[PDB]
Structure 1
Amino acid sequence: QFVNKQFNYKDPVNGVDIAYIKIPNVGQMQPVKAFKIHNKIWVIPERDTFTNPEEGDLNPPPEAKQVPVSYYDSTYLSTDNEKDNYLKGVTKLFERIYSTDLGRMLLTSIVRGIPFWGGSTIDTELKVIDTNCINVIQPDGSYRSEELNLVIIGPSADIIQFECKSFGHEVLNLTRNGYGSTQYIRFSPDFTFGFEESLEVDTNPLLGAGKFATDPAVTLAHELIHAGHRLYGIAINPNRVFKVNTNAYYEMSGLEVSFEELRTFGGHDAKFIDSLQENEFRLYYYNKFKDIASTLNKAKSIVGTTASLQYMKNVFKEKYLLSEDTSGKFSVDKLKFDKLYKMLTEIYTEDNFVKFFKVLNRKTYLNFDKAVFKINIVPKVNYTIYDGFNLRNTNLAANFNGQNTEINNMNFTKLKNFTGL
């Protein structure tokens, strides 16, 4: 079991795993109630009005601009009951991901993926990077800094814009230099997307109303895979995009999909990135792990009193699977690097999780969303850790009937259609 406490949103704060916290954003903010569901992983059941100064409220953009696939509701996730349900929904989804061998591996890699202590401007000293921590209000009212890897937070204005956010460094590209950084995942367990079972229908923008619902566990896993990349500093620059020439409608609109998203989906999508660049990326991040080992070897003392130099050097030797001689000098073994790189990029994919969940799912990232549904996964009669919607020993166990929004219509309320627009 991944989440040892069944938190209720109204549980009293203790300054340990139920606390009012502040996020290291450049602006001001009122403390927000947060829940530590696992070592290094916190959940904030609030709409993310914090990580991005440009998204400080919940109203859509009124400047003759509006993205087609979007959904707005400024009251969602504003009541204590919604926040309680959000917390239990997210918890349930982590347990579902933890219930599979692949999910356990991913969550283990994510917990191990401590953002690198590269904040020191002096080579002989190892120092944390402040924006990889939160500030936790203690029972005496004072703040203490706590390192963390992952935050699950509510979506911003656009409810169905699920994405990873993280704080940048002035000089460093933390998500693409091997360092990594604390990841804020905007996510909701209260909505899901509809897709079409037929491939030609799913990839056509004019057809389908979204007969089947995506298992939210897959959506979170997709998100967590992205966070794994960025926590290990191997995320592919989103400016590297594949000019889709395999879907006449994508080409018609000149749609480009980032290599990072094709990689995350896996399956055939990941094959659109040809060998020459794949090799280039691998070699690029292999060197970054070399510079990390070269930084560790120069560090002779540590900054602060939270942990010893020896301990932090070992934390990063285990994160990056470095090699260590008797004198403590670290190096990167190409074999072990390729092992970890492939693990994070090819083993952890959305298409692989589909196999472990035994759910129905979009066959490619290169499709067209059909509709968005309101769901409630907290009741065991709706959704279980082990089966998602396809509850065993009911009519929903077979043929993914649980995700069939026409057969299981009581579990889905269609809110918006995207076909045609």
Structure 2
Amino acid sequence: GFVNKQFNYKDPVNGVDIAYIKIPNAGQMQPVKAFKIHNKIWVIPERDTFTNPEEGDLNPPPEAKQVPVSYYDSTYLSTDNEKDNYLKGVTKLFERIYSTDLGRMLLTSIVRGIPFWGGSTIDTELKVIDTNCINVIQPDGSYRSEELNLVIIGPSADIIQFECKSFGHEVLNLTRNGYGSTQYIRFSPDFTFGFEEGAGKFATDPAVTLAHELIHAGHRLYGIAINPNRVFKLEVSFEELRTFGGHDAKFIDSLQENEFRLYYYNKFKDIASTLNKAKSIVGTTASLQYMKNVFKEKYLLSEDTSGKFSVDKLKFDKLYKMLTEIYTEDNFVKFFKVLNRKTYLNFDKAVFKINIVPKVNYTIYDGFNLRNTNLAANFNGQNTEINNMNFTKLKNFTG
């Protein structure tokens, strides 16, 4: 079990794993109910009008997006019952990922991926960066700051626009300097998009889509995301190609991979020297020794008998390759043994309402492709024309 409590949206607040929280969006917001599903991971069953307060309007834009498929519904995820169904869906998707060895590994890497304590103006002092925390409300209406790695939140305006995003910093490029930052994944388990394989019409397994986003989060928590302005020539970012994997990832050549490899060895070495020169820490509950050990475990640092850290090249290479070549969408497709589109780019627009919460629809083990039934054959379970009761087709947005 990756998620040990089976939360109901109604369940009473306890200020520990069910609480009203505020995120550090740099805006005034009212508290939202949130759920801690595992150490360092929370879920917020709300439409995301928060990570960017400049994105409150859940209505469609005058200029329709052209690729990929898009869909708008301002009322989705507004009622307690959808929030409850949302929460059970996301939990179920976590258990499906965790039931795989690749998933278990990915999720463990995410939990260790504590964002680095680079908040101090003093180069000898460790200090948390506030945008890597949330504020949890207490009985007396005060707030306590809690550190976290990951938040799953409902989509913004485009219901099927999933993405992994995070709060930035004034000088630091936290997702690219090796530090990392808390990641916010806009995601819905209540909808999916189709692909073709006339041609057969299939639905993407949303455990695959979630895994896709978790892979982004993995990169960004370890501060090794590829700048989005680095693109493979249409136009697709290296970061997407890397995340998707399969034949797509081999388009990032051998030479650019080596630069990134060297670049990040150098980052990890810098973080090791910041830790070695650390003489003080801000905060009441964690010792400098304790945080030094947290980052030793994260970056897989070597510790000598005198307490000093260094990077082992062998363990670096393995970690790096793990996060970038092993954790890929293509690799999850293999482990899940489901059908998935063959490339990142997908021009065959189709969106569906689904409901993976009932076991008669979708299980942790087989997804839609229920074993020992007609849906285990030929990915029938994902065939939107065979398993049509599980995929209610929606009008994709055209403007």
TM-score in same-fold range (> 0.5): yes
Count of aligned positions:
398
Deviations 1:264-284 (A, max 9, x none): 111111100111111011111
- Larger deviation, residues 132-141 vs 148-157: 132-141
Flag as ranges the 4+ runs of structure 1 deviating above 2 A.
60-69, 416-420
> In structure 2, do the counterparts of structure 1 residues 318 and 369 end up closer, same or farther at CA, with 3 Å as the change threshold?
farther
Given the alignment of the two structures, is residue 293 of structure 1 paired with residue 272 of structure 2, yes or no? yes
Partner Cα distance (2:67, 2:302) in 1 = 48
Partner Cα distance (1:68, 1:195) in 2 = 11
The answer to whether the 8 A contact 1:14-1:139 is kept is: no
The answer to whether the 8 A contact 2:109-2:218 is kept is: yes
Deviations 1:139-178 (A, max 9, x none): 3322100000000000000111100110001110000000
Cα distance, 1:369 vs structure 2: 3.8
Cα distance, 1:69 vs structure 2: 2.6
> In structure 2, do the counterparts of structure 1 residues 64 and 161 end up closer, same or farther at CA, with 3 Å as the change threshold?
closer
Describe the SS at the equivalent of 2:318. Answer: helix
Partner Cα distance (2:340, 2:325) in 1 = 18
Partner Cα distance (1:11, 1:419) in 2 = 40
Describe the SS at the equivalent of 1:176. Answer: coil
Deviations 1:116-145 (A, max 9, x none): 001011122110000000000113322100
Deviations 1:271-312 (A, max 9, x none): 001111110111111111111111111111111112011010
Partner Cα distance (1:117, 1:64) in 2 = 41
Partner Cα distance (2:396, 2:147) in 1 = 41
The answer to whether the 8 A contact 1:370-1:418 is kept is: no
Partner Cα distance (2:213, 2:285) in 1 = 30
The answer to whether the 8 A contact 1:222-1:350 is kept is: yes
Deviations 1:302-347 (A, max 9, x none): 1111201101000000000111111211111211111100000011
- Larger deviation, residues 324-333 vs 46-55: 324-333
- Larger deviation, residues 139-148 vs 75-84: 139-148
> In structure 2, do the counterparts of structure 1 residues 63 and 385 end up closer, same or farther at CA, with 3 Å as the change threshold?
closer
The answer to whether the 8 A contact 1:68-1:418 is kept is: no
Partner Cα distance (2:383, 2:104) in 1 = 28
Given the alignment of the two structures, is residue 233 of structure 1 paired with residue 223 of structure 2, yes or no? yes
The answer to whether the 8 A contact 1:114-1:319 is kept is: yes
Given the alignment of the two structures, is residue 415 of structure 1 paired with residue 394 of structure 2, yes or no? yes
Percent identical residues: 100
- Larger deviation, residues 48-57 vs 35-44: 48-57
Cα distance, 1:57 vs structure 2: 2.2
- Larger deviation, residues 389-398 vs 186-195: 389-398
- Larger deviation, residues 356-365 vs 36-45: 356-365
> In structure 2, do the counterparts of structure 1 residues 35 and 213 end up closer, same or farther at CA, with 3 Å as the change threshold?
same
- Larger deviation, residues 409-418 vs 57-66: 57-66
The answer to whether the 8 A contact 1:19-1:136 is kept is: yes
Cα distance, 1:258 vs structure 2: 0.6
The answer to whether the 8 A contact 1:265-1:350 is kept is: yes
Partner Cα distance (1:150, 1:367) in 2 = 27
Partner of 1:47: 47
Describe the SS at the equivalent of 1:15. Answer: coil
The answer to whether the 8 A contact 1:195-1:370 is kept is: yes
Partner Cα distance (1:409, 1:64) in 2 = 28
The answer to whether the 8 A contact 1:7-1:88 is kept is: yes
Deviations 1:4-29 (A, max 9, x none): 00000010000000000000011110
> In structure 2, do the counterparts of structure 1 residues 317 and 65 end up closer, same or farther at CA, with 3 Å as the change threshold?
closer
> In structure 2, do the counterparts of structure 1 residues 418 and 267 end up closer, same or farther at CA, with 3 Å as the change threshold?
farther
TM-score, scaled relative to structure 2: 0.97
Cα distance, 1:224 vs structure 2: 0.1
- Larger deviation, residues 310-319 vs 294-303: 294-303
The answer to whether the 8 A contact 2:115-2:180 is kept is: yes
Describe the SS at the equivalent of 2:42. Answer: strand
The answer to whether the 8 A contact 1:370-1:419 is kept is: no
Partner Cα distance (2:65, 2:98) in 1 = 40
Describe the SS at the equivalent of 2:249. Answer: helix
> In structure 2, do the counterparts of structure 1 residues 167 and 194 end up closer, same or farther at CA, with 3 Å as the change threshold?
same
Unaligned runs of 5+ in 1: 198-207, 244-254
Cα distance, 1:386 vs structure 2: 0.6
The answer to whether the 8 A contact 1:371-1:419 is kept is: no
Partner Cα distance (1:66, 1:195) in 2 = 16
Partner Cα distance (1:366, 1:114) in 2 = 32
1:222-371 correspondence to structure 2 within 5 Å: 222-243=212-233, 255-371=234-350
Deviations 1:104-127 (A, max 9, x none): 000000000000001011122110
> In structure 2, do the counterparts of structure 1 residues 367 and 140 end up closer, same or farther at CA, with 3 Å as the change threshold?
same
The answer to whether the 8 A contact 1:263-1:345 is kept is: yes
Given the alignment of the two structures, is residue 24 of structure 1 paired with residue 12 of structure 2, yes or no? no
Deviations 1:232-284 (A, max 9, x none): 000000100000xxxxxxxxxxx211111101111111100111111011111
The answer to whether the 8 A contact 1:18-1:33 is kept is: yes
Partner Cα distance (2:398, 2:10) in 1 = 40
The answer to whether the 8 A contact 1:164-1:227 is kept is: yes
Deviations 1:18-60 (A, max 9, x none): 0000000111101000000000000000000000132122122
Describe the SS at the equivalent of 1:212. Answer: strand
Partner Cα distance (1:80, 1:42) in 2 = 18
- For the aligned residues, what is the CA RMSD? 1.7
> In structure 2, do the counterparts of structure 1 residues 173 and 368 end up closer, same or farther at CA, with 3 Å as the change threshold?
same
Describe the SS at the equivalent of 1:42. Answer: strand
Deviations 1:55-84 (A, max 9, x none): 122122247887773110000000000000
The answer to whether the 8 A contact 1:41-1:149 is kept is: yes
Partner Cα distance (1:418, 1:13) in 2 = 38
